[PDB]
Amino acid sequence: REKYYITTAIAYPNGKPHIGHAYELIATDAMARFQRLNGMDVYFLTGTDEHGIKMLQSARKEGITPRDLADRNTSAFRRMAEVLNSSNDDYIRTSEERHYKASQAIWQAMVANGDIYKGGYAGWYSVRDEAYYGEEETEVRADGVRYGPQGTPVEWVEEESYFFRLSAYQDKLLDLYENNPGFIMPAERRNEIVSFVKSGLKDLSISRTDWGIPVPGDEKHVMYVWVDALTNYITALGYPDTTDERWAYWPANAHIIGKDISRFHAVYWPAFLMSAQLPLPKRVFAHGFLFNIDPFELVERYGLDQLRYFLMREVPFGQDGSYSHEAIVNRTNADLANDLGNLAQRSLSMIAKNCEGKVPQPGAFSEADKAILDQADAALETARKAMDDQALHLALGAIFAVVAEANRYFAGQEPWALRKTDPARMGTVLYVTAEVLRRVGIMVQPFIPQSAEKLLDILAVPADKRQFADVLASPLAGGTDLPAPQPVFPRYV
Ligand code: MET
């Protein structure tokens, strides 16, 4: 069984969880579940990034230690994962001892390759981004203060600092981008990165000089928060122990991240991995941002699956998008409550009332029967091709187009009228509808897991007949008992 490793960015837990974090986790969860159902051996990581100057300063404001703050706020992030029904296999915190040892190992690996030196710089520095900047990347605003590109103040500094020889990787990075056209996506991101690297790379500062991982052999220094943070992805697999059973999951198939942190993952990270003699992830994919506050309240007001569906359907993955009360209510009423849920309820109640709650024996399929059935099978192939490109909206779009067409099929067959005229044919039509519903049910599991389970329970589908392979392999059999149908998607109160 082919191995598939997917990760989310690890959030700074310096406050409460926000919807950005929830969005990223839901989308990564969907992708992970999709691949499980598609027959892969999946490892799915998320976690928290607990070092950094931004954590230090938040700790000071609250008047506690950064470990204290990290420990307190992290519980909320873990609780968010449980509430969003996240299927992650591990949870990483960069305060753990395994990470400390991982980060010091990858560091040593880069030193062994000759890519790390101690040196002197003189330039603008932002304390909060732990990064130097060139005068060109800065501006003096009306308050008379010079700001760097990432929004924060820069001051002039002359210090010794450890450096990574990022200049030695310009050409190897450009080859990576030619040879692997899907390494950093979507396209708008690819071009930012390719252009940034074509225009020249300066060596990168990777230490400062008391909350972080000490640079091995020189404890007066601590590792820049990004070197540390990126290592999370290989820490979770047992690095540096390459005989750990998890290690075969490396290289990651997909790092899901937000667009504001592309450069770290598509430039720094591969450079570091090359240096440490490790293989590179197959893809980094950057989602956009959401605009209107608290994920827990949203789940409470709308339902988890309603929110999951909305976010993954209404925004093209990669692009920025909007959400509002009215949008979520209307789109989830239309697609879930009405289109899918009411097709299930009407059809399954007709089977309950008119066929003794047994799946009816289908006869010859008509042209219209074969068309809707085939459209369902076709949706699986489209969903697969979509998810390979992180196109969650297209995967869901294809599956729900089958739902829309199934309502038209149902209405147009007029099965109530057939009750009197032709009960054999009524049965065939109810069969088809039930069978289309089984195929949809299987396909939507990754996106709306609990609701999908409830819809398949209603269709009496065994627990071991809900893989994507079962869409073609395991059709409903006439005669099977079905429990009394309750609505799966209540209309919004
Ligand atoms: C190695 S992913 C680190 C992400 C970072 N803590 C952020 O939230 O921006």
From TrEMBL:
<comment type="function">
    <text>Is required not only for elongation of protein synthesis but also for the initiation of all mRNA translation through initiator tRNA(fMet) aminoacylation.</text>
</comment>
<keyword id="KW-0436">Ligase</keyword>
<feature type="short sequence motif" description="'HIGH' region">
    <location>
        <begin position="11"/>
        <end position="21"/>
    </location>
</feature>
<keyword id="KW-0067">ATP-binding</keyword>
<dbReference type="GO" id="GO:0005737">
    <property type="term" value="C:cytoplasm"/>
</dbReference>
<dbReference type="InterPro" id="IPR009080">
    <property type="entry name" value="tRNAsynth_Ia_anticodon-bd"/>
</dbReference>
<dbReference type="GO" id="GO:0005524">
    <property type="term" value="F:ATP binding"/>
</dbReference>
<keyword id="KW-0030">Aminoacyl-tRNA synthetase</keyword>
<dbReference type="InterPro" id="IPR014758">
    <property type="entry name" value="Met-tRNA_synth"/>
</dbReference>
<keyword id="KW-0963">Cytoplasm</keyword>
<dbReference type="InterPro" id="IPR023457">
    <property type="entry name" value="Met-tRNA_synth_2"/>
</dbReference>
<dbReference type="InterPro" id="IPR041872">
    <property type="entry name" value="Anticodon_Met"/>
</dbReference>
<dbReference type="GO" id="GO:0004825">
    <property type="term" value="F:methionine-tRNA ligase activity"/>
</dbReference>
<dbReference type="Pfam" id="PF09334">
    <property type="entry name" value="tRNA-synt_1g"/>
</dbReference>
<dbReference type="GO" id="GO:0006431">
    <property type="term" value="P:methionyl-tRNA aminoacylation"/>
</dbReference>
<dbReference type="InterPro" id="IPR015413">
    <property type="entry name" value="Methionyl/Leucyl_tRNA_Synth"/>
</dbReference>
<keyword id="KW-0648">Protein biosynthesis</keyword>
<keyword id="KW-0547">Nucleotide-binding</keyword>
<protein>
    <recommendedName>
        <fullName>Methionine--tRNA ligase</fullName>
        <ecNumber>6.1.1.10</ecNumber>
    </recommendedName>
</protein>
<dbReference type="InterPro" id="IPR033911">
    <property type="entry name" value="MetRS_core"/>
</dbReference>
<feature type="domain" description="Methionyl/Leucyl tRNA synthetase">
    <location>
        <begin position="4"/>
        <end position="347"/>
    </location>
</feature>
<dbReference type="Pfam" id="PF19303">
    <property type="entry name" value="Anticodon_3"/>
</dbReference>
<feature type="domain" description="Methionyl-tRNA synthetase anticodon-binding">
    <location>
        <begin position="359"/>
        <end position="493"/>
    </location>
</feature>
<dbReference type="InterPro" id="IPR001412">
    <property type="entry name" value="aa-tRNA-synth_I_CS"/>
</dbReference>
<dbReference type="InterPro" id="IPR014729">
    <property type="entry name" value="Rossmann-like_a/b/a_fold"/>
</dbReference>
<comment type="subunit">
    <text>Monomer.</text>
</comment>
<comment type="similarity">
    <text>Belongs to the class-I aminoacyl-tRNA synthetase family. MetG type 2B subfamily.</text>
</comment>
